[PDB]
Amino acid sequence: SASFWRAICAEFFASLFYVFFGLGASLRWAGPLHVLQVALAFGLALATLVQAVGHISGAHVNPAVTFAFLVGSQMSLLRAICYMVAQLLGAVAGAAVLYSVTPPAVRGNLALNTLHPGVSVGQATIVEIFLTLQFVLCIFATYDERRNGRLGSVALAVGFSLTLGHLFGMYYTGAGMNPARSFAPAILTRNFTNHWVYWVGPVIGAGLGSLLYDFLLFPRLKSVSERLSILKG
Amino acid sequence: SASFWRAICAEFFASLFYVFFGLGASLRWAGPLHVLQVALAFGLALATLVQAVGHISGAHVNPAVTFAFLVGSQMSLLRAICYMVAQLLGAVAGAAVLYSVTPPAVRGNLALNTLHPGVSVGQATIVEIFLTLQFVLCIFATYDERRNGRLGSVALAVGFSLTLGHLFGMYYTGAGMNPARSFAPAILTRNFTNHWVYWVGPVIGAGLGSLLYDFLLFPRLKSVSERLSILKG
Amino acid sequence: SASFWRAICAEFFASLFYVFFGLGASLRWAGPLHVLQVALAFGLALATLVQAVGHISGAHVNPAVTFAFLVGSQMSLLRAICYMVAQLLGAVAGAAVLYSVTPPAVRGNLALNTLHPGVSVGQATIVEIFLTLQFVLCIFATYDERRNGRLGSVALAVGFSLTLGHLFGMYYTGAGMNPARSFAPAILTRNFTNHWVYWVGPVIGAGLGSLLYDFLLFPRLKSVSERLSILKG
Amino acid sequence: SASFWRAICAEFFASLFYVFFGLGASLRWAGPLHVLQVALAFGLALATLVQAVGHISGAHVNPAVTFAFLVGSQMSLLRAICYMVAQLLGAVAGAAVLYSVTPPAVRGNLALNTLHPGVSVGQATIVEIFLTLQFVLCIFATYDERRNGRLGSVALAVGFSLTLGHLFGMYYTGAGMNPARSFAPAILTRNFTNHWVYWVGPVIGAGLGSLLYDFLLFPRLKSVSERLSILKG
């Protein structure tokens, strides 16, 4: 039904907003102030967007997040691909629109995710993994219909999880936690240096999060039947 | 019924508070610290006011927001006009009372919305549009009775949306997102320079937000009948 | 019943905690950082305490707040007096315990509420009034059983209202918004300079808040009968 | 049942995350900025983890917290021991993994809890006590099934309680409030100087919190029967 294309649209616009506001708030340099401010910006961007379209598409706005739900057998392979496609175009569009209204000199590299001189790509990949792992873990747990009438706003919980990822990570890798968010700055600045970290960390972290939740913490046992039936629809 | 004049009163007092506390917290200069602090101040002012009178008038406290609900066919043309009238007088009053208790030298221009030297009015109008667009989008989505038992506090969601608007926007336009909030400082400092941006951006953004929500994301299909019936009451 | 002395105890301990953590976090000087940090500290102290004992005593932890509920005919004159008595002793105790574990040199004046050199006591009284007014207004609205299933945490709403009061007020009067919180530092440092502001502003603001809510925004019409019956119990 | 080993696992992973992100965000020095940022990091780490596994193990992720529930007769002596065991190994593991991905020079002492030169261990023990006391008090009150449909997110309430503990405490003792969180940095840096404070304060504070709640504020009267029956299972 049209109850599918609306979601794809939700994922496109939300991703454009997420990157537009996220990157926009990161322009400049610096420091606690800097980190604190950028951590809150991305976090509140997500909390806002999750309230805005979480009921419509589940507000993934993140390829690694969508990948998590795929292996978690909660969405079809067809939906996953489109979500990720919409997320990549949306992100690029947000970065594009951001570039068009931002004064040069302040533009910098459009907040491209970058490693710290003293951090190896190996350590950086492990950082991005842990960041995305606690992040996806919070998403799965709070989206789980099987629990709590005392959750409060799941939109904010997830947003603050993203903020926590930044408060810690920015010092190491600028905190990617999202392939699409990393990709947009890279494709427009023509700089794919160390970009592998920002696809690998999240995907693996997202993978370990889903697995850890569904197959150990609070098992959601699906029969091989449904798995394929879902991965198909 | 009197269940109409109470709301107008709600919109008047809330607007006076919103501008009084919002502007008051913006006095001085500066920087992350500055932005972070002012972003939170406006955001918590709104979250507070939305809890205070959201059940009474819907706590629009913003002309562009009210305009959004008009074209969204959720209020009558009569209510909209009064809301906006109450919002403009309330704002001016808040700025007035703020001026009366604030020491000169610190008064400055009473936190008048201003463009960054390197930002054209065109880019500034597009910024204000995006700010108000994600803002109204969050308002519509969270006010929508058709969704979530997991929303948490809608008052805070909207407040944090406003904070996000500031964390990004202040650097560009000081972040208006509200004609009344921009107007009060302008009418009292007799400075309407670039004021057009602060009416145009929000109104258009507010317009694109409502349209985007009601006519694409989660369509609320009203028959031409009701539209006029509502725009009339 | 004992369902009265538990509340008095709740108000005593909560007040000791409120002042202990509130003042403790204010030691030193400074600036956004300073204000932001102290605003959040008092705010989260209250949100925490309101969750801790709001169901037991309503968590007034504030004489001006209790006064608001008295004139609002929601508590007896007997309860009000005891609450305020417990709040004053609790506060002093918190400041006392704070003094005993804090290193001198850092102690300063134990975060005594103070006016800004350029702010007259008249302007300062009007500031404290507005601060306490939006504060009590938020308390009444969020405690009102007659509304919202979308309030979220009222504990946090009120806490953030207090934070907003500080983000704006600290620059003017250090932000009292609470006679007991102002009193404790004064009685122990033997400095009652301008102390009148910190009793007068809140009480009046608290008074205007209750009146504004119960007699105009969302009238809670009590017959003269009940008023006295309540003011008596 | 397996509805016991999942919880132990929950407590292990959550503790590893808590310390990994908590310590990681504390690396460096400094100041409001520093404190504010670290306070929020620990706070949001907990709020996140409480949402992630609070429904599975109650998300104690803290020996002093678990001890509180033991004397509160809410868990068996067998569960308590395992929880604390899982919490200690989890913490050490988190600090270990943190060390492996963090650049030296920035590693410092891995955010080891430390006293301020001007603070005696006696004053420091009293500080840690008060910090953990308001903390446990908030936990008990918000976990209490006997109250509120207006609590909002208990995960966030507790998290913000932890943040408040840091906003005040870091200046004194770096804010331990958690034996496991203090232990991990100590065992790996081979520095147990003043470590006694970080086990004694929390345990006593946690003890006074439970007692204060269950035996005075909102008594949860258990017959000697059940007490032992529970302490046994």
Locate tokens 């005040």: which residue? D168
| CA A74, A77, A81, A86 torsion-angle sign | negative
**Distance in angstroms (rounded) separating the CA atoms of residues B34 and B28:** 9
The residue type of D88 is L
Owning domain of residue A120: 1-233
CA distances from B90 to A81, B60, B199 (A): 50, 12, 17
DSSP collapsed to 3 states, chain C: CCCCHHHHHHHHHHHHHHHHHHHHHHCCCCCHHHHHHHHHHHHHHHHHHHHHHCCCCCCCCCHHHHHHHHHCCCCCHHHHHHHHHHHHHHHHHHHHHHHHHCCCCCCCCCCCCCCCCCCCHHHHHHHHHHHHHHHHHHHHHHHCCCCCCCCCCHHHHHHHHHHHHHHHHHHHHCCCCCHHHHHHHHHHHCCCCCCCHHHHHHHHHHHHHHHHHHHHHCCCCCCHHHHHHHHHC
**Residue A194 is encoded by which pair of tokens?**
């160390």
By the 8 A CB rule, do A155 and A47 touch? yes
By the 8 A CB rule, do C191 and C67 touch? no
**Distance in angstroms (rounded) separating the CA atoms of residues D178 and D199:** 8
The total number of residues shown for chain C amounts to 233
DSSP collapsed to 3 states, B43-94: HHHHHHHHHHHCCCCCCCCCHHHHHHHHHCCCCCHHHHHHHHHHHHHHHHHH
CA distances from D84 to B160, D39, D90 (A): 37, 24, 10
**Distance in angstroms (rounded) separating the CA atoms of residues D223 and D233:** 15
Output the furthest CA–CA distance in chain D (Å, rounded).
Answer: 56
**Distance in angstroms (rounded) separating the CA atoms of residues B156 and C153:** 10
**Distance in angstroms (rounded) separating the CA atoms of residues D49 and C33:** 27
Nearest residue of C to residue B18 by CA position? C134
Q: Which residues contact C214 (CB under 8 A, 6 or more apart)?
A: C72, C140, C220
**Distance in angstroms (rounded) separating the CA atoms of residues D37 and D102:** 19
The residue type of D90 is G
**Residue A147 is encoded by which pair of tokens?**
């629990």
B156 and A156 in contact by Cβ < 8 A? yes
Q: What is the CA radius of gyration of chain D?
A: 17
**Distance in angstroms (rounded) separating the CA atoms of residues B25 and C168:** 5
**Distance in angstroms (rounded) separating the CA atoms of residues C26 and C197:** 20
- DSSP track, chain A: --TTHHHHHHHHHHHHHHHHHHHHHH-S---HHHHHHHHHHHHHHHHHHHHHHTTTT----SHHHHHHHHHTTSS-HHHHHHHHHHHHHHHHHHHHHHHHHS-TTT-TTSS-----TTS-HHHHHHHHHHHHHHHHHHHHHHH-TTS-S----HHHHHHHHHHHHHHHHHHHH-----HHHHHHHHHHHT--TTTTHHHHHHHHHHHHHHHHIIIIIS-----HHHHHHHHH-
Nearest residue of C to residue D137 by CA position? C52
Output the furthest CA–CA distance in chain B (Å, rounded).
Answer: 56
By the 8 A CB rule, do B216 and B142 touch? no
The residue type of B113 is N
- Supply the angle between the helices A77-101 and B121-143 in degrees, to the nearest 10: 140
CA distances from A162 to A157, B156, B162 (A): 9, 18, 19
**Distance in angstroms (rounded) separating the CA atoms of residues B210 and C48:** 37
Q: What is the CA radius of gyration of chain C?
A: 17
Substitution target in C18, C29, C36, C48 with the highest count of D β-carbons within 10 Å is: C48
**Residue B79 is encoded by which pair of tokens?**
């209510």
**Distance in angstroms (rounded) separating the CA atoms of residues B109 and D61:** 50
**Residue A73 is encoded by which pair of tokens?**
């057998």
Other Cβ atoms closer than 10 A to B121:
14
Q: Which residues contact B50 (CB under 8 A, 6 or more apart)?
A: B59, B154, B155, B158, B159
Cα distance from N-terminal residue to C-terminal residue, chain D: 13
Q: Which residues contact B199 (CB under 8 A, 6 or more apart)?
A: B179, B182, B183
CA atoms within 13 A on the CB side of D219: 11
Report the candidate in A60, A108, A68 with the shortest Cα–Cα distance to residue A85: A60
Report the candidate in D164, B48, D133, B49 with the shortest Cα–Cα distance to residue C40: D164
**Distance in angstroms (rounded) separating the CA atoms of residues A10 and D48:** 25
CA distances from A81 to A70, A88, B65 (A): 10, 11, 36
Q: Would residue C67 be called left, alpha or beta, if left means φ above 0 and alpha means ψ between -120 and 50 degrees? A: alpha
**Residue C110 is encoded by which pair of tokens?**
């134990």
By the 8 A CB rule, do C172 and C116 touch? yes
**Distance in angstroms (rounded) separating the CA atoms of residues A90 and A93:** 5
Report the candidate in C68, C59, C10, C16 with the shortest Cα–Cα distance to residue C180: C16
Locate tokens 């918000």: which residue? D142
The total number of residues shown for chain D amounts to 233
Q: What is the CA radius of gyration of chain B?
A: 17
For residue C168, give the nearest of B21, B103, B156 by CB distance.
B21
**Distance in angstroms (rounded) separating the CA atoms of residues D82 and D61:** 12
DSSP-based three-state secondary structure for D214: helix
| Phi, psi of B164, deg, nearest 5 | -60, -40
B31 and C36 in contact by Cβ < 8 A? no
> What are the helix (H) ranges across chain D?
5-26, 32-53, 63-71, 77-101, 121-143, 154-173, 179-189, 197-212, 224-232
**Distance in angstroms (rounded) separating the CA atoms of residues D192 and A55:** 50
Output the furthest CA–CA distance in chain A (Å, rounded).
Answer: 56
By the 8 A CB rule, do A222 and A230 touch? yes
Q: Would residue A141 be called left, alpha or beta, if left means φ above 0 and alpha means ψ between -120 and 50 degrees? A: alpha
**Residue B21 is encoded by which pair of tokens?**
């506390």
The total number of residues shown for chain B amounts to 233
Please report residues of A whose CB lies closer than 8 A to that of C152: 152-153
Other Cβ atoms closer than 10 A to C3:
7
Contact of A212 with chain D, judged by CB distance below 8 Å, is answered with yes
Nearest residue of B to residue C36 by CA position? B37
**Distance in angstroms (rounded) separating the CA atoms of residues C185 and C23:** 8
**Distance in angstroms (rounded) separating the CA atoms of residues C213 and C215:** 6
Q: Which residues contact C121 (CB under 8 A, 6 or more apart)?
A: C115, C194, C196, C197
**Distance in angstroms (rounded) separating the CA atoms of residues D78 and B131:** 54
By the 8 A CB rule, do D143 and D51 touch? no
CA distances from D38 to A164, B161, D30, D175 (A): 10, 24, 11, 10
CA atoms within 13 A on the CB side of C30: 17
Q: Which residues contact A36 (CB under 8 A, 6 or more apart)?
A: A167, B32, B36, D33, D36, D37, D40
Q: What is the CATH number of the domain that holds A154?
A: 1.20.1080.10
C36 and D36 in contact by Cβ < 8 A? yes
Query: CA triplet B220, B224, B228: central angle to 5 degrees?
Result: 100
Instruction: Determine the distance in angstroms separating the CA of C232 from the nearest CA of chain A, rounded to an integer.
Output: 37
| Phi, psi of D26, deg, nearest 5 | -90, -10
Contact of D39 with chain A, judged by CB distance below 8 Å, is answered with no
**Residue B89 is encoded by which pair of tokens?**
């007088």
Contact of A126 with chain D, judged by CB distance below 8 Å, is answered with yes
Report the candidate in D17, D22, D184, D44 with the shortest Cα–Cα distance to residue A205: D17
Q: Which residues contact B176 (CB under 8 A, 6 or more apart)?
A: B113, B128, B131, B182, B197, B198, B201, B202
Q: Which residues contact B180 (CB under 8 A, 6 or more apart)?
A: B15, B19, B61, B62, B63, B84, B87, B88, B90, B91
The residue type of C214 is D
Nearest residue of B to residue D32 by CA position? B33
B217 and A100 in contact by Cβ < 8 A? no
Instruction: Determine the distance in angstroms separating the CA of A121 from the nearest CA of chain B, rounded to an integer.
Output: 29
For residue A55, give the nearest of B116, B118, B147 by CB distance.
B147
- Which helix or strand (DSSP H or E) is residue B115 part of? none
Contact of C102 with chain D, judged by CB distance below 8 Å, is answered with yes
Give CA B205 to chain center in angstroms.
Answer: 11
CB burial class (10 A; 0-12, 13-18, 19+) of residue B2? exposed
Cα distance from N-terminal residue to C-terminal residue, chain C: 13
Contact of C164 with chain B, judged by CB distance below 8 Å, is answered with yes
Q: Which residues contact D163 (CB under 8 A, 6 or more apart)?
A: C40, C44, D39, D40, D42, D43, D44
Q: Would residue A149 be called left, alpha or beta, if left means φ above 0 and alpha means ψ between -120 and 50 degrees? A: alpha
Substitution target in C37, C143, C144, C167 with the highest count of B β-carbons within 10 Å is: C167
By the 8 A CB rule, do D86 and D18 touch? no
D118 and C106 in contact by Cβ < 8 A? yes
By the 8 A CB rule, do C51 and C182 touch? no
| CA B63, B194, A40, B13 torsion-angle sign | negative
By the 8 A CB rule, do B142 and B155 touch? no
**Residue B189 is encoded by which pair of tokens?**
């400092």
By the 8 A CB rule, do D5 and A124 touch? no
Locate tokens 């959550």: which residue? D14
Report the candidate in C86, C22, C25, C23 with the shortest Cα–Cα distance to residue C56: C86
Breaks in chain C (C–N > 2.5 Å) following residue? 30
By the 8 A CB rule, do C160 and B44 touch? yes
**Distance in angstroms (rounded) separating the CA atoms of residues B212 and B205:** 10
Total structural domains within chain A: 1
**Residue D64 is encoded by which pair of tokens?**
């002093």
By the 8 A CB rule, do B160 and B139 touch? no
By the 8 A CB rule, do D41 and D22 touch? yes
**Residue D210 is encoded by which pair of tokens?**
């439970």
Give CA C201 to chain center in angstroms.
Answer: 12
**Distance in angstroms (rounded) separating the CA atoms of residues C24 and D47:** 24
**Residue C13 is encoded by which pair of tokens?**
């301990």
Other Cβ atoms closer than 10 A to C149:
8
**Distance in angstroms (rounded) separating the CA atoms of residues B114 and B62:** 19
Q: Which residues contact A148 (CB under 8 A, 6 or more apart)?
A: D54, D55
**Residue D87 is encoded by which pair of tokens?**
């919490």
B141 and A31 in contact by Cβ < 8 A? no
Give CA D9 to chain center in angstroms.
Answer: 17
Report the candidate in A158, A127, A144 with the shortest Cα–Cα distance to residue A210: A144
Contact of B8 with chain C, judged by CB distance below 8 Å, is answered with no
A41 and B218 in contact by Cβ < 8 A? no
Q: Which residues contact B221 (CB under 8 A, 6 or more apart)?
A: none
Tell me B7's DSSP state: H
